[PDB]
């Protein structure tokens, strides 16, 4: 149909066989690092909430070899990438500082490399390939910064903490790629393991890992294959909202901050205000609530949070689109349905039975106006290295 395969061993392949091309050598080693699928807990993140994520079999390599001359030379084999596919450039200084620009690829290659830890950092030569498709909603920014990450550990160890290389990473997406994002993606294509989500408490950062086992139960990625001009511009103005509904109440985060007490301090904040804070706290509950449920193997409470955290999500956040309200509606003739990620387009995330998945994929294409992607997705490994 038009299910992707993820093809792994493929995207390897494929990325060894361009590095001995292109620079003459065998590649010395291989990472990757996954994208994501958030079963729920939208726009909790930045709220110091909770998120509920998978790691994807969809995936970002790079295969590369130290260099002596401190620079680093790149090469993407990315459909999608923009153009130039390669670029060179000197490595960081005091004196002089690694810039954003042309191609926009790079600039998360650049942010990592800018703000990486430890030292003596070497040059490198490097093949980037992903299966991930390319702002489709599952964190390619991301898969990459982790795997940049993941590369530059292997040339200069860093003697750290998750939770700082996450940070690294998120700070390569918001002073690079102008996209003040909290710490969600990162943080699952570091820790992601196969066979599990990831509960993330983005207010301690303490996480915890979910068995996601049961055969019975599987999860359908549908790409609506649409992107609205509001993704890139609306995210920041719900972000910089959320910071006012708790600017008054007194409340660092809205973390700190219950339904009880918005529903008693409505008139306090805007009615833009209550709405979005409706959502959030909405969706913190339903993500603990989903976590207990997914632990208890209750699917239908979990399954009626994500229908649950779609219609929030639509009504009160205003960060769906018609392509996700009808991919759902669509799917939701399924344990559930709800758009994933930062919304305007990308993926919905489909709790299904294993057994229905051949006549979903039927319905769905059958009953969506635009493109439908699938993807039939394991929960996946985070970061790891090949020596080769
Ligand atoms: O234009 C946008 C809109 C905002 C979201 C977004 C981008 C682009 C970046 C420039 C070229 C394609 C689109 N790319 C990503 N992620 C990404 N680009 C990758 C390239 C190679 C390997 C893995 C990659 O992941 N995200
Ligand atoms: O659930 C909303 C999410 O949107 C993502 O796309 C963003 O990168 C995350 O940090 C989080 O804010």
Known sequence: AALRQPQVAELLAEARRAFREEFGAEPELAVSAPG?????????????????????????????????????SLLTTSEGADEPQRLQFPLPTAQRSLEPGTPRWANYVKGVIQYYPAAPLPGFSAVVVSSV?????????????????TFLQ???????????????CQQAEHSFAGMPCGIMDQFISLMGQKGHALLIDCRSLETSLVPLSDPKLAVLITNSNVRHSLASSEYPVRRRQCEEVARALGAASLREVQLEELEAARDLVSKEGFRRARHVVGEIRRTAQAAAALRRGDYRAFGRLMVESHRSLRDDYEVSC???????????????????????????????????????????????????????????????????
């Open 36 to 72: 994501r699928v958030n079963l729920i807990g939208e726009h909790t993140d930045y709220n110091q909430g909770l998120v509920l994520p998978m790691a994807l079999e969809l995936m970002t390599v790079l295969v590369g070899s130290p260099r002596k001359d401190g620079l680093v």
């Open 133 to 149: 498709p390319l702002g489709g909603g599952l964190s390619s920014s991301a898969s990459l910064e982790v795997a940049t990450y």
């Open 322 to 388: 018609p392509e996700l309200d009808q991919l759902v509606e669509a799917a939701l003739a399924v344990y559930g349905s709800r758009m994933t990620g930062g919304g305007f387009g990308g993926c919905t995330v489909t709790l299904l039975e294993a057994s229905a998945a051949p006549h979903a994929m039927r319905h769905i294409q059958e009953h969506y106006g635009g493109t439908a992607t699938f993807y039939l997705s394991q929960a996946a490994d985070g970061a790891k290295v090949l020596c080769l």
């Open 154 to 168: 292997q040339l200069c160890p860093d003697s750290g903490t998750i939770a700082a290389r996450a940070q690294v």
